[PDB]
From Swiss-Prot:
Organism domain of life: Viruses
Name of the protein: Protease/Reverse transcriptase
Active site location: 17
Residues of the full protein shown: 8 to 98 of 1149
Signal peptide range: none
Domain Peptidase A9 residues, every copy: 1-91
Organism of this sequence: Simian foamy virus type 1
């Protein structure tokens, strides 16, 4: 059951993953954007750096802004730190 989210006014499906500590979005939303900060990641094949993008999107009808990473996926990934209310039941 994918969640609903709106990025830059664009409506798309999203997935909640507590394992993720940072929101992850598809480059399709960063193609014409710019990363405010970058992160360095070391891998067995070599060292890779991940760019960070601060975007604004609605989470279940809730305007919320957070940094997201660009990914080849076709959806969005929400973290438990950005959507702390999702863990709590709605009133």
């Amino acid at each position: 059951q994918p969640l609903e989210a709106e990025i830059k006014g664009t409506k798309l499906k999203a997935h909640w993953d507590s394992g993720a500590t940072i929101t992850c979005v598809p480059e399709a939303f960063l193609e014409d954007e710019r990363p405010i900060q970058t992160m360095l990641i070391k891998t067995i094949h070599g060292e890779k750096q991940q760019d960070v993008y601060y975007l604004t999107f609605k989470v279940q009808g809730r305007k919320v802004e957070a940094e997201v990473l660009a990914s080849p996926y076709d959806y969005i990934l929400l973290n438990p730190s950005d959507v702390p209310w999702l863990m709590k039941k709605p009133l």
